[PDB]
Every structure is written in structure tokens, then in C-alpha cells.
Paper text:
S glycoprotein trimers protrude out from the viral membrane and are the major proteins on the viral surface, making it the main target for vaccine design. Overall, the S-trimer structures are similar to those previously determined for B.1 in situ, and are similar across all variants.
The majority of S trimers from all strains have all three RBDs in the closed state (hereafter, closed state), ranging from 73% (Mu) to 88% (Delta); the Mu variant has the most populated 1-RBD open state (hereafter, open state), constituting 25%. The Mu variant has been reported to be about 10 times more resistant to antibodies elicited by either natural SARS-CoV-2 infection or mRNA vaccination as its parent B.1 strain. The prevalence of the locked state might contribute to this behavior by altering the conformational distribution of the antigenically vulnerable NTD. Our data do not provide an obvious structural explanation for the presence of the locked state in the Mu variant. When aligning the HR1 residues, the position of loop 940–945 in Delta and Mu (N950) differs to B.1 and there is a change in the rotamer conformation of K947; these changes are not observed for Alpha and Gamma (D950).
Residue numbers in the entry:
A (entry chain A): 295 to 622, 631 to 676, 689 to 735
B (entry chain A): 1030 to 1148
C (entry chain B): 736 to 827, 848 to 1078
D (entry chain C): 736 to 784
Write the structure that this text describes.
């Protein structure tokens, strides 16, 4: 502890005093994982490997639900030529859970894959398929010239070329209404400045990559306070309660002591929150009991020292900590029962609790002070307020001073401080 | 202003004790005041009374306090034991003896009476 | 404040980014420690002026003056006076959320028992020895005689005290009863202490509320960021949280430094009133209450001192011709 | 200070971003209000004796 003092002061000498050197924290005994007990594998092959994809103006959507997804198979597949994730990291994705996953799937030009991203604009982003600016999900695309082209061109794939407005996020518009580019109306028929709003892609196999077909899937992840139904492949551990632990509940990483809760969760509620947004309680996804989450205990570590010229002996106060909590800072050699004293300032280690009272030398708090005293060691005591005295009052007695002493008392006052620019 | 350029009646403003005077000394970024104070010492117990009853009149000290060594009564200043004979000069009269709780009987020396009697 | 635990919780990823801000957390911890050491000094300079713990005599023959409402009451182990109980049961938030988020309250060095024992000694010295225990050793004097010295001190001849001593004692006892009634029943006078307690509770509450702020990160919950993003992506969001939480904690520390300066000005004033009104009789016109100051009695209050200023107020004036 | 009018003017796009900083504008308004209430108290304690 004297070394943590010397370091926090950045000094080899330490004056007499009490110094914050560290904060103590109880370390986790083990790491829990709790996902729902789902064995059904997710049908990603059904969306990524269909014989025929949708046109982007009429883009397909499929719910992925109540299933286990090994997204690392997707990301480490060499086949996908782009695999861009937003609001999530694809490595981390294998240990999250989601209320649902929506797979959106369609075909576009290779040039247009850049438009399938949050905050994009362009013919596809504006008139066919819009991701929200705060999209969480991954966009997965691959060249499909060996599938979605044919000689003479694949007219089966269409895109909306015109609309009166650009789309809202995840809006779809299959409407066949002939579109007015003209100043005059179209009267419901084609004409000058009056066009069918969909155009087909030329997908001749001969075309360069910017005009080759690309199949696209957008895995959209709904992170909600709703229960999880899609999860990564990570296996649930058993639960442990009063031991300090790391945990993962449906992707809620945290640490604490999982006390069995008294809190009366309504059947829809999945998590409890503190006054800060930190998680205060959690429902177990398998047993559906309620657990409190409280942090493993912690506190300031004040080191009590005489000057290093006087001694290298030091006592340690675990501030606000209980002596039933202090572990046998960085070092392990304290909490020896030979010197333990539960002050209201905290558990005090390495000082002898004497019965006397003296003037306060080093303050500890809640009436406690410590000093280095004889065979010298750190003593802790209730500070003395002064000599207790009886004035000898009487209704007819007076004390009159028969002499005097002239006293000279030094008073020092700061007047200025150093002028700086 | 109040301790160097003055004498302060303010109890602890210029050191512990009754302030006599203070001396300024300069210090780095500071001032040091050396406060000279009178501290009373070697106090003794006395019997005391608020008033003396004499000739049915109540006498009070003009300044100071009445004290007895056990057999005789004196008047003295409050902050230094300097006993004086109780006289019509160092006391003033107000009212009769009946009203003062704890009044004591003693003679009060009038100094003019013997200057007449010795003429 | 455990500045690392406030800003980062238990995340080492955040802690390692918080190292890149350098000494800011050490500056914050050191400023709050200086404030805390000042609060002990403020209490010491107000109450621990009395060099000996004077006890009152067992029999209270103070000439008809009745201090029983302001002298220590033995019936409680805290040993407060009755009026001190009125104060401590009248001035006296979110402590659990604060504690779990790195914010903690240190106890004062002097307990309320020790502060009550200092006010006890100041009262005992005052009523048994007048001003003399301020200047030196306590010299006993009968209470009615030192009250007659107070009357001389306001320029009223001491015979006016002795000739009216029963009246003056009845008036004092009645006015101490009015202190009891007012402090039992008012909603106004204690506003200076309530305001200080409210300001500090509000400041800690606000500092905890700032942990809910996104500061433009994808979550305010730092464990959401670290469960959902890996280092290169997460660091941008963790840095947004670090920036806003460090600015929140610096705002708190700055305003605590300003409040501590105001509380020290108030403790300097309280220490000056202890010296000049309790240990003395003040000629300073309004310094020790309205009227000509006779004497003052200290009472402890939560984080505060109460002075009961006894003053002579002249009454029932008559018109005279004068020359 | 109308902290939203100072930082953002009448823009709601800015106002909605300024909400993400949490209570800072409430802290600022409350500090300036405490200063203003103190200025009345300072004048009262000097003159209304
Ligand atoms: C003032 O006197 C008291 C006791 O009074 C005694 O009887 C008087 C009639 C007179 O003869 C006094 O001189 C006598 O002393 C002293 O109080 C005692 O002090 C001692 C310590 O010195 C203590 O052990 C006793 O318990 C005290 N008794 C009481 C009743 O308080 C007091 O010390 C005298 N003051 C001075 C300055 O000497
Ligand atoms: C719900 O229905 C309304 C009306 O059918 C849709 O309104 C369209 O709104 C956009 C602008 O947001 C306009 O450009 C379209 O012209 C509107 N259509 C019609 C026929 O008036 C609305 O978009 C629909 N919302 C969803 C989510 O489908
Ligand atoms: C330190 O911890 C102990 C328990 O480990 C506390 O003592 C217990 O307090 C509860 C009341 O909350 C009692 O019901 C128990 O009987 C007590 N047990 C023992 C063995 O005393 C103690 O109060 C704690 N002290 C501090 C300062 O935190
Ligand atoms: C109280 O003080 C008086 C002082 O006057 C003492 O009496 C005097 O003693 C001297 C001798 O020392 C005599 O010569 C005087 O005649 C005495 N005075 C008078 C007025 O007669 C007295 O002894 C003291 N008493 C105590 C108990 O100390
Ligand atoms: C002080 O002197 C007066 C006399 O001047 C004393 O008063 C007398 O007391 C006796 C009883 O002891 C009564 O019988 C007399 O009538 C009283 N005289 C007068 C004039 O009222 C008084 O007792 C003395 N005080 C002390 C303490 O001895
Ligand atoms: C001094 O004043 C107090 C005022 O509280 C008096 O205390 C009361 O005394 C009666 C008995 O005489 C008790 O029944 C009450 O309960 C007491 N009140 C409290 C609040 O304690 C006390 O009697 C007065 N003493 C003198 C000598 O005047
Ligand atoms: C001085 O003022 C007091 C009041 O503070 C007067 O005392 C009251 O007198 C009435 C009768 O006139 C009594 O009923 C009250 O009980 C008294 N009060 C107290 C506290 O004793 C007193 O009479 C006034 N004196 C003069 C000379 O005017
Ligand atoms: C798609 O089907 C082929 C068989 O034609 C298979 O080899 C391949 O692994 C499948 N891809 C996916 C992603 O399931
Ligand atoms: C999931 O596991 C828990 C035990 O951890 C069990 O009680 C529960 O019935 C299981 N749920 C289902 C749907 O089988
Ligand atoms: C340092 O310790 C030595 C003894 O080892 C002692 O003589 C000296 O006075 C001490 N000085 C200070 C400044 O503590
Ligand atoms: C210290 O004080 C307590 C009582 O306050 C007592 O139980 C204990 O035995 C004392 N220890 C010594 C060594 O006197
Ligand atoms: C002191 O008390 C006694 C009774 O014990 C009484 O006779 C005397 O008048 C009182 N003196 C004073 C000054 O109050």
C-alpha cells in the first residue's frame, strides 16, 4: 500500500497523512451465460440460397424467429462480395440476441449495392428500398451473373425509375400507376412525359460488373426490450446467485451479484433499470424468475501513513466497506485478522484499536483518528475533544485573576498568489 | 486596520486573550500578525456580592466587583485582583436594600466625614 | 467520486480509453478531496474553539434564568439539547444508485455527538464563566452578576439588572419558550441549511441522471456498446460517452468548488460569531441579533450552527424635554 | 439564458440533438436562476434593514 501511495503521489517520500491510493473492487468468481433454450436452427439457407430472388421495387421480407443463428458461417463465407454491418459488429453478432430478425431480399445492379446503406440516396435508395438512418443490421450482397442473367437479357428483374416522393424507411411500393413527369396530367395512360414507373434491368451475361445482377439480403435486427427469440449459438450455463459473477442475459453483458429479487415484475417486463440507465434487475430467459443485479462491492482505499522518514508501516482503510467484505487495491497481503477494526468510516486494517483518546493526529472519520505510537505501530482511537473540566460555579463565588501573562500569538494569512499568464 | 492600526475589542479577532497590540511581519505571499494579548493568570476564589447594604441604601460598584477574603469586603476591577476599600466614591447608590437578591451588609467608607471630623 | 467507476463502470475498454485523457480524473478526485478536508476544517474552526470540555454544575442556581431547553438533555445518547433536537428533527436522496455508480459520501470527522459535546462546553463556559473562558481559563462568576456586566456593557447601569432581575429572568425564559415554539412550527428560518442540503443532493442526483445521456453514442449503456461493437467501432462510441460523462463530472466538481467557497465564507462567519457573540459581548450593532447584544448561546444543527442571540431591546419610550 | 434558443435557435433538428446531452441546459438555467435570486437577496440584506 505504501507503494500505491508513492505512485499516486508520484513521489518517493510520503508526508504524514491519509491518501486515496486505489479503489477496491470484488472480482468475478465465474462467467454466466443465459439464452433461451431454443434448439431450432435459423432458416438462413432459405433466404440466401433461393433459386429466384425478388425485384427490388417489390422487395421480399421474411421473419426469422424462434431459432438459433450462427452468423459467423455467413460472414466467413467467401461467396458474399460485400458484407456491411451497421449498429452492430459481425464478430459480436454471434453472441447477441434479438426479438426478431427480418431478412429483406432482392436483386439490383452491382453499381447500386453502394445505395443499400443507411442515409444513402439514389434511384434505388429513394424509389425502391430505404434503410433508416439509424439502421441496425447487416447488408449482404453477391454477384449473381451466373443466376439472374440470361442471353438476350433477364427482363424478369424490375426497378422503380420514378416516384412522386422518395420512400420512407422500409416502405414498399408495388403500385403500377403510370407516372407524370410532365407538367400536365397523364389521364391514366402513357404519353409525352408520361411513363410506366418501373424499368427493367438489362442483365445480359456479357455486361460489365457494374451492370451485372447482384443478389442482396438485408438482415435487420430488432433490438427491443421485448423477449429474445433469435440468438447466437452460445450455450447457456447454469445460474449462480449470490456469488459475484460476469453474466450475459440474451446479450445483456454485465457483472454483479445475481440476488434473487423481491421485485414484482409484471409478466411483460424483461429488464429493470436503475436511475442511471444501468440494468438493475433481469428476468432469467429459461426459468423466468427475477434476479436483482447489484455490483460486486467496491470502495476507496485510503492508506494511512506516518512520514516515510518516520516509518514505512501503513494502515489501510477500506472506505465504507464492511470487514466481512475486505479480501485477503493490487496487493493481497492485508485483511490479516491481527489488525482489523470496523469504523463507521469503513473497515480499518493494520491499526490497533486502543482504549485511550488523544488529540487527532491523522483523521480517519466518524470520530476516529490514527497516530504512530509505541515498539511503535499505527494506533486507531476516538479523538479527544479536550480536557474535561468543572467550572466550580456558585451563586456567590467569583474567581479573579491575581496575575497575568503577556502572550504573543502568530497569525499567518495568505495575501496573494503567484501571478501567471 | 483593526489589530495593528487599532486595539480590537473583538474577542478572538487579534489572538487569544484581551488584545493589546499587533505587529505586522511580511511573509512570502502573506502577512504575519504577532498579536500581543493580555491573558489573565493565577486566579483566586472570592466570595462576591452584587451590592452592599449600608444605612438602608444599596451600593453598587461604579466599576469592578465586590469581593470578600472571608472577613472583610473590598471592591476590585474585574480582570486583575487589586482590592480597594469600599467607599462612597468607588460605589454608586440606587434604591434601598430590599430589592437586590443576595445583597450583603457592610460599612461603606465616606471620605468626607473624617475630613470634617478632623478639621 | 470514483471517477473511473463513474465514467466507465467496470469496463477496462473504457478505462483504457480514459487513460488517454491523462490527469483529469486525478484532478477531479483531488478537488473533491480538498473540499472534503475543508468541511472538517470548517467544523473544527466553528465548534472546537473551546479548549476544555466544561461541564455545567449539577445544581442550576443561575438566578432565575432557565437554560434547561438549551443545555444538554441526558435522556438521549446523542446528548443533544431540546432545541438541538428540534433542529436535528427538522432539517433531517438516491443514495443506492449513487453508491453503485461510483459516488460516495464520506462521514465528517466530528460526529454529531462530538459537536453536541462542544456546544455543551461552550454553553457551560458561557453561563458559568461569562466571557472569561474565551480570553483564558474559565473564571466562575454568578450568572446574575455577569448579566449585570452585560447590562453595563450595553450602557445600562447594573442596578437596572438587579432591581429587575426577576422580570429579566422571566422575559428570558419566555423568549426561550418562543424559540422552542417557532422552531417547532416554522417553515422559514432554517432555509439557509435546507438550501445547502438541497443543492448538494440535487447536484448528486443530476450527476447520476447524466449517466442516462447518450451524448450522441448509440447507447447511454456502455455495456450495450461493448456487447454490440468491437474495439475499432466501439471506441468511437465509448469516446462519446467518456467526453460527455467527463464533462458532467467536471461540471459537478467545479460547482462543488464554488459551493465549498461559499460554505467556507459561512463557516468563517460562524466562527467569528462564536468568538464575538458566544465567547464575548459584541458592540457591533446587528452582528449578534437585533437589539443591544447581551449574550449568545450556540446550538448545533445538521451541517450548521444555531446562535440564540439574547439582546436588550428598549421599550415604552417617553417624550422628555432635553438640554 | 434560453439554453435551447442560444445553442439551437428555433431549429428542432438541433433541439433533438441537444436532448441527447441530457440535463446540461436544465443545469445552466438553474444556475443562472440561483444567481438571479441571490441578487435580489443581496439587495434586500443591504437596504431593507
Ligand atoms: C474555587 O473553589 C472550588 C471549591 O471551593 C472550595 O471552597 C470555597 C469556600 C473556597 O475555600 C475555595 O477556595 C475552595 O476550593 C474549587 O473547586 C475544586 O477544585 C478541585 C481541583 O482544584 C476539584 O478537585 C474539586 O472537585 C473542585 N470542587 C468543586 C465543588 O468544583 C476551585 O478549584 C476553586 N478555584 C480556584 C481558581 O482555585
Ligand atoms: C399508408 O397509406 C397512405 C395512403 O394510402 C400512404 O400514403 C402515401 O404517402 C406518401 C408520403 O408519405 C405519398 O408520397 C404517397 O403518394 C401516399 N400514397 C397515396 C396513395 O396517397 C402511406 O405511405 C402508407 N404508409 C405505409 C407505411 O405504407
Ligand atoms: C457489517 O456487516 C455485518 C454483517 O456481516 C453487519 O451486522 C449485521 O447487521 C444486521 C442488521 O443489518 C443484523 O441483523 C445482524 O445480526 C448483524 N450481524 C452481526 C454478526 O453483527 C454490520 O452492521 C455491518 N456494519 C457496517 C458498518 O457495515
Ligand atoms: C482580609 O483582609 C483584611 C485587610 O484589611 C485583613 O485584615 C487586616 O490585617 C492586617 C494585618 O495583616 C491588620 O493590620 C489590619 O488591621 C486588618 N484590617 C482591618 C480593616 O482591620 C484580614 O486579615 C483578611 N482576612 C482574611 C481571612 O484573609
Ligand atoms: C442586614 O442588616 C439588616 C438590618 O439593617 C438585617 O435585618 C434585620 O433582620 C432581623 C432578623 O435577623 C430582623 O428581626 C430585623 O427586623 C431586621 N431589620 C430591619 C431593619 O429590617 C439583616 O438580617 C442583615 N442581613 C444579614 C444577612 O445578616
Ligand atoms: C425550566 O423550564 C423548563 C421548560 O421546559 C421546565 O421544564 C418542565 O418542568 C415540569 C416540572 O416542573 C415538567 O413536568 C415538564 O415536562 C418540563 N418540560 C420540559 C419540556 O422538560 C422546568 O421545570 C423549569 N425549571 C425552573 C426551575 O423554572
Ligand atoms: C415592563 O414590561 C413588562 C412586560 O415585558 C411588564 O411586566 C408585565 O406587567 C403586567 C402588569 O402590568 C403583568 O400582568 C405581566 O405578567 C408582566 N410581565 C412580566 C414578564 O413580568 C412591566 O410591568 C413593565 N414595567 C414598567 C415599569 O412599565
Ligand atoms: C446452397 O446450395 C448449395 C447446393 O446447390 C450448397 O452447396 C451451398 O452450401 C448452399 N449455400 C447455403 C448458404 O446454404
Ligand atoms: C427452459 O429451461 C428451464 C430450466 O432452465 C425450464 O424450466 C423451462 O421449462 C425450459 N423451457 C422450455 C420452453 O422448455
Ligand atoms: C527524519 O528522521 C530522522 C531520524 O531517522 C530524524 O532525526 C529527523 O529529525 C527526521 N526529519 C524529518 C524532517 O522528519
Ligand atoms: C477497549 O475498550 C472496550 C470497551 O470500550 C473493551 O471491551 C476492550 O476490552 C478494551 N481493550 C483494552 C485492551 O483495554
Ligand atoms: C444564593 O443562594 C442562597 C441560598 O442558598 C440565597 O440566600 C442567596 O440570596 C443567593 N445569592 C444570590 C446572589 O443569588
Amino acid at each position: 500500500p505504501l507503494s500505491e501511495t508513492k505512485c499516486t503521489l508520484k513521489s518517493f517520500t510520503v508526508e504524514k497523512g491519509i491518501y486515496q491510493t486505489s479503489n477496491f473492487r470484488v472480482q468475478p468468481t465465474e462467467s454466466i451465460v443465459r439464452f433461451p433454450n431454443i434448439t431450432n436452427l435459423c432458416p438462413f439457407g432459405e433466404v440466401f440460397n433461393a433459386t429466384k430472388f425478388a425485384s427490388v421495387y417489390a422487395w421480399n421480407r421474411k421473419r426469422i424467429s424462434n431459432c438459433v443463428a450462427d452468423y459467423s458461417v455467413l460472414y466467413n463465407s467467401a461467396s458474399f462480395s460485400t458484407f456491411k454491418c451497421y449498429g452492430v459488429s459481425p464478430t459480436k453478432l454471434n453472441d447477441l440476441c434479438f426479438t426478431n430478425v427480418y431478412a429483406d431480399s432482392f436483386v439490383i445492379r452491382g453499381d447500386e449495392v453502394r445505395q443499400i446503406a443507411p442515409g444513402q440516396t439514389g434511384n434505388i435508395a429513394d424509389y425502391n428500398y430505404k434503410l433508416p438512418d439509424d439502421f441496425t443490421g447487416c447488408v449482404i450482397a453477391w454477384n449473381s451473373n451466373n443466376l439472374d442473367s440470361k442471353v438476350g437479357g433477364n427482363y424478369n428483374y424490375l426497378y422503380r425509375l420514378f416516384r412522386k416522393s422518395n420512400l420512407k424507411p422500409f416502405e414498399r411500393d408495388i403500385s403500377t400507376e403510370i407516372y407524370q413527369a410532365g407538367s400536365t396530367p397523364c389521364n391514366g395512360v402513357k404519353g409525352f412525359n408520361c411513363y410506366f414507373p418501373l424499368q427493367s434491368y438489362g442483365f445480359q451475361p456479357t455486361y460489365g460488373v457494374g451492370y451485372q445482377p447482384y443478389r442482396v439480403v438485408v438482415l435487420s435486427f430488432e433490438l427491443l426490450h421485448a423477449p429474445a427469440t433469435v440468438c447466437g449459438p452460445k450455450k447457456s450455463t447454469n445460474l449462480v446467485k449470490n456469488k459475484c459473477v460476469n453474466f450475459n442475459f440474451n446479450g445483456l453483458t454485465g457483472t454483479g451479484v445475481l440476488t434473487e429479487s423481491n421485485k414484482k415484475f409484471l409478466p411483460f417486463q424483461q429488464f429493470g433499470r436503475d436511475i442511471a440507465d444501468t440494468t438493475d434487475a433481469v428476468r432469467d430467459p429459461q426459468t423466468l424468475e427475477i434476479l436483482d443485479i447489484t455490483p460486486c462491492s467496491f470502495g476507496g482505499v485510503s492508506v494511512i501513513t506516518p512520514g516515510t522518514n518516520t516509518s514505512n508501516q501503513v494502515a489501510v482503510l477500506y472506505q465504507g466497506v464492511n470487514c466481512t467484505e475486505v479480501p485477503v487495491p493490487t496487493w493481497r497481503v492485508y485483511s490479516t485478522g491481527s489488525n482489523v477494526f470496523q469504523t463507521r468510516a469503513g473497515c480499518l486494517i493494520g491499526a490497533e484499536h486502543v482504549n485511550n483518546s488523544y488529540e487527532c493526529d491523522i483523521p480517519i472519520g466518524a470520530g476516529i483518528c490514527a497516530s504512530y505510537q509505541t515498539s511503535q505501530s499505527i494506533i486507531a482511537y476516538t479523538m479527544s475533544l479536550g480536557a474535561e473540566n468543572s467550572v466550580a460555579y456558585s451563586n456567590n463565588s467569583i474567581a479573579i485573576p491575581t496575575n497575568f501573562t503577556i502572550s504573543v500569538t502568530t497569525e499567518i494569512l495568505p495575501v496573494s498568489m503567484t501571478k501567471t499568464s | 486596520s483593526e489589530c495593528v492600526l487599532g486595539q480590537s475589542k473583538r474577542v478572538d479577532f487579534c489572538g487569544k486573550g484581551y488584545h493589546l497590540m499587533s505587529f505586522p511581519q511580511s511573509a512570502p505571499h502573506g502577512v504575519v500578525f504577532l498579536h500581543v494579548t493580555y491573558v489573565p493568570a493565577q486566579e483566586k476564589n472570592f466570595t462576591t456580592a452584587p451590592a452592599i447594604c449600608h444605612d438602608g441604601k444599596a451600593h453598587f460598584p461604579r466599576e469592578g466587583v465586590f469581593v470578600s477574603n472571608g472577613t472583610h469586603w473590598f471592591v476590585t476591577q474585574r480582570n486583575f485582583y487589586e482590592p480597594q476599600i469600599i467607599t462612597t466614591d468607588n460605589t454608586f447608590v440606587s434604591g434601598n436594600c430590599d430589592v437586590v437578591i443576595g445583597i450583603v451588609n457592610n460599612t461603606v467608607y465616606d471620605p468626607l466625614q473624617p475630613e470634617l471630623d478632623s478639621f | 467520486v470514483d471517477c473511473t467507476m463513474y465514467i466507465c463502470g467496470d469496463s477496462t475498454e473504457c478505462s483504457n480509453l480514459l487513460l488517454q485523457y491523462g490527469s483529469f480524473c486525478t484532478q477531479l478526485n483531488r478537488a473533491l478531496t480538498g473540499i472534503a478536508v475543508e468541511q472538517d476544517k470548517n467544523t473544527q474552526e466553528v465548534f472546537a474553539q473551546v479548549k476544555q470540555i466544561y461541564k455545567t454544575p449539577p445544581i442550576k442556581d443561575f438566578g432565575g434564568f432557565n437554560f434547561s431547553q438549551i443545555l444538554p438533555d441526558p435522556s438521549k445518547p446523542s446528548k443533544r439539547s431540546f432545541i438541538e433536537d428540534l433542529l436535528f428533527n427538522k432539517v433531517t436522496d438516491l443514495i443506492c444508485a449513487q453508491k453503485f455508480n461510483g459516488l460516495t459520501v464520506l462521514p465528517p470527522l466530528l460526529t454529531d455527538e462530538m459537536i453536541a459535546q462542544y456546544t455543551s462546553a461552550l454553553l457551560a463556559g458561557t453561563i458559568t464563566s461569562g466571557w472569561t473562558f474565551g480570553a483564558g481559563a474559565a473564571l466562575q462568576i454568578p450568572f446574575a452578576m455577569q448579566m449585570a456586566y452585560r447590562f453595563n456593557g450595553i450602557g445600562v447601569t447594573q442596578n437596572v439588572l438587579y432591581e429587575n432581575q426577576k422580570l429579566i429572568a422571566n422575559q428570558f425564559n419566555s423568549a426561550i419558550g418562543k424559540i422552542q415554539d417557532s422552531l417547532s412550527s416554522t417553515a422559514s428560518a432554517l432555509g439557509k441549511l435546507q438550501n445547502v442540503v438541497n443543492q448538494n443532493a440535487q447536484a448528486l442526483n443530476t450527476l447520476v441522471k447524466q449517466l442516462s445521456s447518450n451524448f450522441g453514442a448509440i447507447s447511454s449503456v456502455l455495456n450495450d456498446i461493448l456487447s454490440r461493437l468491437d474495439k475499432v467501432e466501439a471506441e468511437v462510441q465509448i469516446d462519446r460517452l467518456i467526453t460527455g460523462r467527463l464533462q458532467s463530472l467536471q461540471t459537478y466538481v467545479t460547482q462543488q468548488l464554488i459551493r465549498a467557497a461559499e460554505i467556507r465564507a459561512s463557516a468563517n462567519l460562524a466562527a467569528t460569531k462564536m468568538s464575538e457573540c458566544v465567547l464575548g459581548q459584541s458592540k457591533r450593532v446587528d452582528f449578534c441579533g437585533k437589539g443591544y447584544h447581551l449574550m449568545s448561546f450556540p446550538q448545533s444543527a445538521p451541517h450548521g450552527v444555531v446562535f440564540l442571540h439574547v439582546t436588550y431591546v428598549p421599550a415604552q419610550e417617553k417624550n422628555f424635554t432635553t438640554a
